[PDB]
mmCIF file of C-alpha atoms and ligand atoms in Angstrom:
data_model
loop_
_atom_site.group_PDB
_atom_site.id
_atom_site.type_symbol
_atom_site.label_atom_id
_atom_site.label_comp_id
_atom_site.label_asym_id
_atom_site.label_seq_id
_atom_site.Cartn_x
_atom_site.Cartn_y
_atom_site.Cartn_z
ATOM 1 C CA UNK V 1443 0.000 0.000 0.000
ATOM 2 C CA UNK V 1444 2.174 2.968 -1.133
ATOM 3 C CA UNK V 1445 1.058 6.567 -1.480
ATOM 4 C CA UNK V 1446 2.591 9.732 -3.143
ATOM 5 C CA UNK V 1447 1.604 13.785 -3.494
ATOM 6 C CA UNK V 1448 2.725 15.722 -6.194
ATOM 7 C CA UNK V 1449 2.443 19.415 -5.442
ATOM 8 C CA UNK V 1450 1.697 21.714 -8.723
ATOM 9 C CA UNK V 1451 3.129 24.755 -9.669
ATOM 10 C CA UNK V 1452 4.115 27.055 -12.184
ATOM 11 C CA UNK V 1453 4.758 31.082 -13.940
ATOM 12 C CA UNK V 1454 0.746 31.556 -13.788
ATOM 13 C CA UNK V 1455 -2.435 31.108 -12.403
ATOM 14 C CA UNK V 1456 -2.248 27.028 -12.017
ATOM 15 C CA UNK V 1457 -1.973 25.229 -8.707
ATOM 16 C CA UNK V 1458 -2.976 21.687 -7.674
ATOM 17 C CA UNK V 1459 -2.114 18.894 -5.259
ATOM 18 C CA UNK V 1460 -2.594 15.393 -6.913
ATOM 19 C CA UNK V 1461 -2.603 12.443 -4.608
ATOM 20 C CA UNK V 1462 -1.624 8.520 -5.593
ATOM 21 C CA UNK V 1463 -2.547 5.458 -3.875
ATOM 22 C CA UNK V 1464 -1.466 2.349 -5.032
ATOM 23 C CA UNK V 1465 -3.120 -0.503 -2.717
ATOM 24 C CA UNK V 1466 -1.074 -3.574 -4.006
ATOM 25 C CA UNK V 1467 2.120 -3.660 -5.841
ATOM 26 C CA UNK V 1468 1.263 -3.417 -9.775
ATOM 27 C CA UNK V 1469 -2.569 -2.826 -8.942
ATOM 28 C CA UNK V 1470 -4.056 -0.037 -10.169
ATOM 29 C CA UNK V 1471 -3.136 3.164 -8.843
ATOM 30 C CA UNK V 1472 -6.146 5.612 -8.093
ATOM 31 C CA UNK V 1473 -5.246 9.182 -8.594
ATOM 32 C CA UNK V 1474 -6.920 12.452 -7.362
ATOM 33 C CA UNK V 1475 -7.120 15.569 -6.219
ATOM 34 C CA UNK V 1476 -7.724 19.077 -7.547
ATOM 35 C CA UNK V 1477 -6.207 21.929 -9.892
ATOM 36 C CA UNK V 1478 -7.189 25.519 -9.811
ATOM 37 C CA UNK V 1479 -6.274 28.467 -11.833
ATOM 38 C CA UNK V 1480 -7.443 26.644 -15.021
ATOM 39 C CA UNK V 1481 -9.555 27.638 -17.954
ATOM 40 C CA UNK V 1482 -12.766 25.714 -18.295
ATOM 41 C CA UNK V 1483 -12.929 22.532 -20.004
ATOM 42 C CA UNK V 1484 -10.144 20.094 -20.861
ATOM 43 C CA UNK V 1485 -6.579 19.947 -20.396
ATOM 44 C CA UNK V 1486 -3.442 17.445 -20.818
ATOM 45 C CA UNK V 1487 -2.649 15.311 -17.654
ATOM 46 C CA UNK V 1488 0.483 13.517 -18.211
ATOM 47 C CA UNK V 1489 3.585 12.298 -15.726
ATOM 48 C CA UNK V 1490 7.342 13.604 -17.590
ATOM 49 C CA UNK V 1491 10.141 11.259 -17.059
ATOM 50 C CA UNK V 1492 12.804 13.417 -15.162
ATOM 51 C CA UNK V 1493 12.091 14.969 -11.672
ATOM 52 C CA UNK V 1494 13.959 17.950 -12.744
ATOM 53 C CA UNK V 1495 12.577 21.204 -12.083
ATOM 54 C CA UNK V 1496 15.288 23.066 -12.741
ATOM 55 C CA UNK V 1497 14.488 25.507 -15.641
ATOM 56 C CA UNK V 1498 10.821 25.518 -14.516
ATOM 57 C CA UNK V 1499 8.879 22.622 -16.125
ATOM 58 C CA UNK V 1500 11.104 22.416 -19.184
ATOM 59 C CA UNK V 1501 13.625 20.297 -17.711
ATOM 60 C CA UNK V 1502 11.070 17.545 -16.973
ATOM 61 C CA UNK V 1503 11.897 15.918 -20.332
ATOM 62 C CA UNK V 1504 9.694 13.898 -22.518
ATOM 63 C CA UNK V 1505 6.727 11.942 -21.741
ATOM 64 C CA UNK V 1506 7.662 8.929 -19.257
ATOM 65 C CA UNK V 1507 8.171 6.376 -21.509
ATOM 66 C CA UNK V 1508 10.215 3.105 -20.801
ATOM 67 C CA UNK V 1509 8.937 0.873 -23.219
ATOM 68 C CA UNK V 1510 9.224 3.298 -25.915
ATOM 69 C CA UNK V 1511 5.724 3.296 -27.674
ATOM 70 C CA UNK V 1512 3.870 6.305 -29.429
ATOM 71 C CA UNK V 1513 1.565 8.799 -27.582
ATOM 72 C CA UNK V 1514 -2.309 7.593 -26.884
ATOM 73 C CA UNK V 1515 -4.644 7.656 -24.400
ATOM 74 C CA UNK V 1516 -4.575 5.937 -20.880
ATOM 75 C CA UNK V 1517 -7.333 3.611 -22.455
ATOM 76 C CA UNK V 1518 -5.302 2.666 -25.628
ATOM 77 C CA UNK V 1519 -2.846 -0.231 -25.781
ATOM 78 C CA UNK V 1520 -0.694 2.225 -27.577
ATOM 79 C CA UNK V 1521 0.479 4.635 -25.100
ATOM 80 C CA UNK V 1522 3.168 5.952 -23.436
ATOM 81 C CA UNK V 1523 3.251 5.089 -19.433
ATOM 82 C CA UNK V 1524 3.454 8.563 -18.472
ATOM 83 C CA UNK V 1525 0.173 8.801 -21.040
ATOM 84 C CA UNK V 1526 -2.975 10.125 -17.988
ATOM 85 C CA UNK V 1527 -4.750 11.347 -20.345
ATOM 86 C CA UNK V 1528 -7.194 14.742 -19.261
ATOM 87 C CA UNK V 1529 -8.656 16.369 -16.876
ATOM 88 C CA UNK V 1530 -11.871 18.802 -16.944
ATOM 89 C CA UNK V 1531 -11.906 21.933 -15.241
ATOM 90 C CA UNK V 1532 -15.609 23.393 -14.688
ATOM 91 C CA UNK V 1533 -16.575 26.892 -14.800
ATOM 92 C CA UNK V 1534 -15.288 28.083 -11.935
ATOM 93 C CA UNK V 1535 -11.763 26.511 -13.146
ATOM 94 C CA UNK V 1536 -10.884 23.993 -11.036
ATOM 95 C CA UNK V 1537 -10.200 20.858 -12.071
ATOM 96 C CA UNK V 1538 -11.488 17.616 -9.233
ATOM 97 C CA UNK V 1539 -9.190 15.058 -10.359
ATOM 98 C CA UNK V 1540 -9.977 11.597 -10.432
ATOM 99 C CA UNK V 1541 -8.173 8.754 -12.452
ATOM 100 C CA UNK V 1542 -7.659 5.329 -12.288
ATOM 101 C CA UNK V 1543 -4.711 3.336 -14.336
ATOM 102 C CA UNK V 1544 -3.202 0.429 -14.353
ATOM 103 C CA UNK V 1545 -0.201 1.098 -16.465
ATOM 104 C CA UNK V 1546 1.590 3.951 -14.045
ATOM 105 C CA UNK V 1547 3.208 2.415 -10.558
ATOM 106 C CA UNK V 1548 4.461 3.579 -7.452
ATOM 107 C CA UNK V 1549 6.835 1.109 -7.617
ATOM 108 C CA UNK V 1550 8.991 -1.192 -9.405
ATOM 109 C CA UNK V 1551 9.442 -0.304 -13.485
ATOM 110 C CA UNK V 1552 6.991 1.710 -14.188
ATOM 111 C CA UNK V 1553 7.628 3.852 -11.061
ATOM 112 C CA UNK V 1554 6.622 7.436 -10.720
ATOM 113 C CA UNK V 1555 7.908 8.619 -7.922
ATOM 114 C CA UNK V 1556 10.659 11.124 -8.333
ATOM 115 C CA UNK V 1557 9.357 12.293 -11.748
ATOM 116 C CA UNK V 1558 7.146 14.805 -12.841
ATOM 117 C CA UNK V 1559 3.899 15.286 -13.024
ATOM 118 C CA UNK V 1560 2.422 18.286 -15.491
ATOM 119 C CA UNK V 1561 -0.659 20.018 -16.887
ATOM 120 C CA UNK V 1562 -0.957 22.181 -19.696
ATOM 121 C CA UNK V 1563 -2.620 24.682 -21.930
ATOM 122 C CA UNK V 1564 -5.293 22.712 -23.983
ATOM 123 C CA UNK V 1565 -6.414 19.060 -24.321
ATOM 124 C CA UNK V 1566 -4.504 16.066 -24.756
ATOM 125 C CA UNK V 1567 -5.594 14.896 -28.691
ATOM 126 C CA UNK V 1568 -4.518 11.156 -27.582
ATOM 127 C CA UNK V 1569 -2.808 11.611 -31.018
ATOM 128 C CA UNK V 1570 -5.270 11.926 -33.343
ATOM 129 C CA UNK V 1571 -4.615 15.177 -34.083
ATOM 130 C CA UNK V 1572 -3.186 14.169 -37.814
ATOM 131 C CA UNK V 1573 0.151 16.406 -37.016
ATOM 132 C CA UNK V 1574 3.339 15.397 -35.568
ATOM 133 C CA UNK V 1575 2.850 17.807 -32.402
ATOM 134 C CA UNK V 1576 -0.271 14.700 -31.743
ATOM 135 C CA UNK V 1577 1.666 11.682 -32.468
ATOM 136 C CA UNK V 1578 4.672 13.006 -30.015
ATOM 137 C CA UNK V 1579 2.732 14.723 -27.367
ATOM 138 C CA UNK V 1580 -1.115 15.201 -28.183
ATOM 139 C CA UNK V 1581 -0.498 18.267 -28.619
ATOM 140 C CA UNK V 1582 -1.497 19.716 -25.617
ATOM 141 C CA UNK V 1583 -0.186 23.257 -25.660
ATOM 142 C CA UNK V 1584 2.233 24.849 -23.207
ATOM 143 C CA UNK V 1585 3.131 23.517 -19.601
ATOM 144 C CA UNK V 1586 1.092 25.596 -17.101
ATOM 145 C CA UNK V 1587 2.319 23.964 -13.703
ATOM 146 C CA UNK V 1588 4.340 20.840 -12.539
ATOM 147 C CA UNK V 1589 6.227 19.633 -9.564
ATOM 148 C CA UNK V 1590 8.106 16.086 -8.156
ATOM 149 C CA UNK V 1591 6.168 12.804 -7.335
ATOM 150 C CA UNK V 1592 6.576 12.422 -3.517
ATOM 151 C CA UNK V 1593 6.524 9.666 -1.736
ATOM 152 C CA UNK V 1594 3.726 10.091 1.173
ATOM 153 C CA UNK V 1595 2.695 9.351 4.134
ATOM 154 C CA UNK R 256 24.569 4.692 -12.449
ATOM 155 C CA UNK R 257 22.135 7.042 -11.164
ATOM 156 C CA UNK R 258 21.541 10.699 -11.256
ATOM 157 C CA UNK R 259 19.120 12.934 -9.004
ATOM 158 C CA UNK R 260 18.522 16.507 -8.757
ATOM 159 C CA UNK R 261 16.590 18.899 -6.313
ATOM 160 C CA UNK R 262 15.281 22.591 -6.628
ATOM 161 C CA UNK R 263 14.985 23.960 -2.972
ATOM 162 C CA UNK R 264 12.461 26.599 -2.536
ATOM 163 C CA UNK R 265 10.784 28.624 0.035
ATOM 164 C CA UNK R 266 8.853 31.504 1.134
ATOM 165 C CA UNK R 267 11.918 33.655 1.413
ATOM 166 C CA UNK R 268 14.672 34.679 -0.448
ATOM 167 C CA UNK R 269 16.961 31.211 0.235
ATOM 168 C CA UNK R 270 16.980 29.099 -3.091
ATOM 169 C CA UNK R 271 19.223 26.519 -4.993
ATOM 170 C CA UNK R 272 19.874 23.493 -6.754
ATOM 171 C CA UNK R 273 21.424 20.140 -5.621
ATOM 172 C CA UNK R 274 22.743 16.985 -7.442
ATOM 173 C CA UNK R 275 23.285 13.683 -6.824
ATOM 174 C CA UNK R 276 25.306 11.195 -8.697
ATOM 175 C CA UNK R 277 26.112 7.553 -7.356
ATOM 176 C CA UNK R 278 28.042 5.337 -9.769
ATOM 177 C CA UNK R 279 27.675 2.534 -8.378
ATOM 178 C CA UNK R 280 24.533 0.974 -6.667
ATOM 179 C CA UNK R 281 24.676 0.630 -2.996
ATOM 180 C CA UNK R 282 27.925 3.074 -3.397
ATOM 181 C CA UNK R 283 28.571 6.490 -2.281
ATOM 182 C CA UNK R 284 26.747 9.257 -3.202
ATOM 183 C CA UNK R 285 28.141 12.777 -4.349
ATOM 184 C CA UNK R 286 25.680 15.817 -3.580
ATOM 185 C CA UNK R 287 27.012 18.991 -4.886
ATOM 186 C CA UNK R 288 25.178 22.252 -5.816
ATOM 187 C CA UNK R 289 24.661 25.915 -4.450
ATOM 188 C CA UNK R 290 22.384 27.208 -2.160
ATOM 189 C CA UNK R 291 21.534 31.516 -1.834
ATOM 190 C CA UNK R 292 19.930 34.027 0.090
ATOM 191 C CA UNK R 293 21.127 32.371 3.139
ATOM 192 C CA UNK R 294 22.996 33.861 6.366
ATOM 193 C CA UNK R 295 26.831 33.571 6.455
ATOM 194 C CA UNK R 296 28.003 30.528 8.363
ATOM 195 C CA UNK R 297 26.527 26.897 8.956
ATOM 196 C CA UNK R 298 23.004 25.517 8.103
ATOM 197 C CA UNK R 299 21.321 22.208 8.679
ATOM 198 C CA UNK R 300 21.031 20.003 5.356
ATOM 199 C CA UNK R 301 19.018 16.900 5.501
ATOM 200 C CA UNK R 302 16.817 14.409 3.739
ATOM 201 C CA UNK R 303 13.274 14.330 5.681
ATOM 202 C CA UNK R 304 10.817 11.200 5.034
ATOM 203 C CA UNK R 305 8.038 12.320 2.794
ATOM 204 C CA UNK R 306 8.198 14.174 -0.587
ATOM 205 C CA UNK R 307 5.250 15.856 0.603
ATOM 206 C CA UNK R 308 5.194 19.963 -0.013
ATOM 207 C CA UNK R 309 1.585 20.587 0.452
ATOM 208 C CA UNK R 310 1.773 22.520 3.578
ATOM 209 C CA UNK R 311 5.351 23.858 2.531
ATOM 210 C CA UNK R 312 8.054 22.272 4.064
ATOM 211 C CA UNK R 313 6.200 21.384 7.390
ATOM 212 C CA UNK R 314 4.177 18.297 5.468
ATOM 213 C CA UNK R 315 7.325 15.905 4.825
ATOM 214 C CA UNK R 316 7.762 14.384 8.100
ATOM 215 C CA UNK R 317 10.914 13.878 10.575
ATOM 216 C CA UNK R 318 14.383 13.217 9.027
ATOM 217 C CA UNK R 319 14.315 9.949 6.949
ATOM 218 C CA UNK R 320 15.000 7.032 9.061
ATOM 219 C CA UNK R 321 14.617 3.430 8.076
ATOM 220 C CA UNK R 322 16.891 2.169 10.449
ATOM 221 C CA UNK R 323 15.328 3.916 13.672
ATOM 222 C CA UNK R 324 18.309 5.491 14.714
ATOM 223 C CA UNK R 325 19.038 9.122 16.600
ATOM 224 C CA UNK R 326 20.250 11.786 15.059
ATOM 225 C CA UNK R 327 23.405 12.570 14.122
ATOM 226 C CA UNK R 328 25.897 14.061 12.264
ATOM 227 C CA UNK R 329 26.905 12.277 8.790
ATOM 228 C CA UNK R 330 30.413 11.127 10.227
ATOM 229 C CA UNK R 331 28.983 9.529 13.129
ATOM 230 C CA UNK R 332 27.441 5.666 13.271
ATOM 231 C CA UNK R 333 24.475 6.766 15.157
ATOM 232 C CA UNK R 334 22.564 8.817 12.250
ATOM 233 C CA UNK R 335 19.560 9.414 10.588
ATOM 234 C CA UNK R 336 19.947 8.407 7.413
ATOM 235 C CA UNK R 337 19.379 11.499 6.205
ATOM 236 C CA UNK R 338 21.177 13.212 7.949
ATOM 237 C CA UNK R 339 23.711 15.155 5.958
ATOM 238 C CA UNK R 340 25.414 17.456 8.667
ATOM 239 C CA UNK R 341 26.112 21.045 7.738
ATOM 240 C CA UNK R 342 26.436 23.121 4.862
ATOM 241 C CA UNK R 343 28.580 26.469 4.502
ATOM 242 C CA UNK R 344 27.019 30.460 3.840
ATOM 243 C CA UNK R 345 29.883 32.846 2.606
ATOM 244 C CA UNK R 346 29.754 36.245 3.556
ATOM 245 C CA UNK R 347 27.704 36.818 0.126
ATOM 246 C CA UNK R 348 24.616 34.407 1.762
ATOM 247 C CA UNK R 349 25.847 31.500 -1.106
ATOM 248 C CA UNK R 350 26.885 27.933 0.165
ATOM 249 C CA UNK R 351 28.460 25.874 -2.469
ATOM 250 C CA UNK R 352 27.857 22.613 -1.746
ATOM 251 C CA UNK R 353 29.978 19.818 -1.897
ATOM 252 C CA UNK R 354 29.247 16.433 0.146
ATOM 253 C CA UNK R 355 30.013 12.506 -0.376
ATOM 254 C CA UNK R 356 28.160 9.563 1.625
ATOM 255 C CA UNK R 357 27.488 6.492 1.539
ATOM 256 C CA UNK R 358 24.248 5.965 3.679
ATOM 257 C CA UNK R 359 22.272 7.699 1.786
ATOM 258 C CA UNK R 360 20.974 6.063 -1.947
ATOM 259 C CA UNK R 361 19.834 6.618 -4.726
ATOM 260 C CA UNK R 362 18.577 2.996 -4.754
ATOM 261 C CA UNK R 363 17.734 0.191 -2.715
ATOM 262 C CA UNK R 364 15.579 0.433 0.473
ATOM 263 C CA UNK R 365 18.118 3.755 1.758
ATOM 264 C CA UNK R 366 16.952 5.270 -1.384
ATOM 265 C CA UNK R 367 16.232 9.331 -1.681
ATOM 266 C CA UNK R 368 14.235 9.714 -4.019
ATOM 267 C CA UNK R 369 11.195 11.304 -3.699
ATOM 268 C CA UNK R 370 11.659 12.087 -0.375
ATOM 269 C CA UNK R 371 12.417 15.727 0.249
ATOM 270 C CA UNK R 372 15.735 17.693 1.175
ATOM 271 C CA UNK R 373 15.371 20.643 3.428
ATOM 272 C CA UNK R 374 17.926 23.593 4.700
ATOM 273 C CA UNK R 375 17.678 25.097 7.821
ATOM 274 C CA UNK R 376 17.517 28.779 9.368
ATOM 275 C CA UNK R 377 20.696 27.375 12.061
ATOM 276 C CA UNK R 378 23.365 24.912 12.504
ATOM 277 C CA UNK R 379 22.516 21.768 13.197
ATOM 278 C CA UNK R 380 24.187 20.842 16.534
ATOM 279 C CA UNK R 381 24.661 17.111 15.443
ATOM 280 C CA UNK R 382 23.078 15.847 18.325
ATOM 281 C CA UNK R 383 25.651 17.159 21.048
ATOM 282 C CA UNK R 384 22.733 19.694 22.057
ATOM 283 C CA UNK R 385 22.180 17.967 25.400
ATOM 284 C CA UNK R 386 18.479 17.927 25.208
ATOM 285 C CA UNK R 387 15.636 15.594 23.564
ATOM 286 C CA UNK R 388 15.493 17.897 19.799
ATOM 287 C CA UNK R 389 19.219 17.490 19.656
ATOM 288 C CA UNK R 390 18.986 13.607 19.098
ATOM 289 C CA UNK R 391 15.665 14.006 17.337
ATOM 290 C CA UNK R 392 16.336 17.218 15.013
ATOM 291 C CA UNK R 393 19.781 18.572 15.870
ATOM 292 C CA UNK R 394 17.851 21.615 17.313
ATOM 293 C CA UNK R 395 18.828 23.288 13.211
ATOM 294 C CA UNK R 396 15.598 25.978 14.151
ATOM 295 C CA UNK R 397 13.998 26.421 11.043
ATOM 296 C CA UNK R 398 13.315 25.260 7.125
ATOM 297 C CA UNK R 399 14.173 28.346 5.163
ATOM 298 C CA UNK R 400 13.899 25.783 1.668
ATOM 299 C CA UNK R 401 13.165 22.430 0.378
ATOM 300 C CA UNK R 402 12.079 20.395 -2.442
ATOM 301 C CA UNK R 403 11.327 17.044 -3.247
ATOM 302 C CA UNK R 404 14.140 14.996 -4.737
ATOM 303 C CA UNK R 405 13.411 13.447 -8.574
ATOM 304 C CA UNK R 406 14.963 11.365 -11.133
ATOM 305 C CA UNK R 407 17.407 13.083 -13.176
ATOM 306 C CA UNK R 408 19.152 13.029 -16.682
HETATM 307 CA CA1 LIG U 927 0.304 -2.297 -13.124
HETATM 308 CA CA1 LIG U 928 25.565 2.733 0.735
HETATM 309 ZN ZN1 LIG U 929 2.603 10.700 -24.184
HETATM 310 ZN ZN1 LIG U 930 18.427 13.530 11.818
#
């Protein structure tokens, strides 16, 4: 039964806390909590493979992906791990989080603790966008906020 | 090989960034970075339990401690262990930071990552304080910066 906390933040308006519970090791791990800040309606929800934070949420490199596959949703086979797909932020902008997927870890390969977690601009496509930006990334827009996987209590 | 990397942060003016490296598994670890906006002269440095930021640095626990131990400095046998000693403010407010040990990993079940290092407002008296927060804390007063330690290129 492992948990982490990511704390998100960023140059604008966008602030979150995500939570991760994972109740047995390669179970599904439920994920949740809530972003603010955000416009309303969708945006890209994915986990970057570096927990570097160094030049703000550029340094978080590319989209965690160990077993090298293309971009796709958290519901298609072809995905990348990192892949969460996205979140919906109501009127008032805030975002109430809650995912379930068996394909992230808190432990053991396909661990996510230590890397980064992000949100951005627009919607994840889940690359069917018909442009390269889509096959890559989904073509989500810009970064708005990010921070380090935790381990917690 | 393994590489790790953590932005410190706080409410006040004392930032930086810190690196690990261990090239081997299970073997020491080099942490080396800078650290600013701090008072001239020694400051508490240590790895706490919990990657957890939420409520600033307050949320991620006591020092890490697998091994139930006291505190202590990082030369001593009974240590935290993350307990990394002291760091160094010049007269400018920068510490350039330079360590090596081998209790704390970037691996295995003394592993770092995602757990959270923290500077402190004081000196951390390395548990020769003669009272109860000097084997618990090392009496270091308080956490000017922190963030949570993540995978690195
Ligand atoms: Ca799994
Ligand atoms: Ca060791
Ligand atoms: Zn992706
Ligand atoms: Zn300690």
């Amino acid at each position: 039964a492992t948990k982490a906390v990511c704390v998100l933040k960023g140059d604008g308006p966008v602030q979150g806390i995500i939570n991760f519970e994972q109740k047995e090791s390669n179970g599904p791990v439920k994920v949740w909590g809530s972003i603010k800040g955000l416009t309303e309606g969708l945006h890209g929800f994915r986990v970057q493979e570096f927990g570097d934070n160094t030049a703000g949420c550029t340094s978080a490199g590319p989209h965690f992906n160990p077993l090298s596959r293309k971009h796709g949703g958290p519901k298609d086979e072809e995905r990348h791990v990192g892949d969460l797909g996205n979140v919906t932020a109501d009127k008032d902008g805030v975002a109430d989080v809650s995912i379930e997927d068996s394909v992230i870890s808190l432990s053991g390969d396909h661990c996510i603790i230590g890397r980064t977690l992000v949100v951005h601009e627009k919607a994840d496509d889940l690359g069917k966008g018909g442009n390269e930006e889509s096959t890559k990334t989904g073509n989500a827009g810009s970064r708005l906020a990010c921070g380090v996987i935790g381990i917690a209590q």
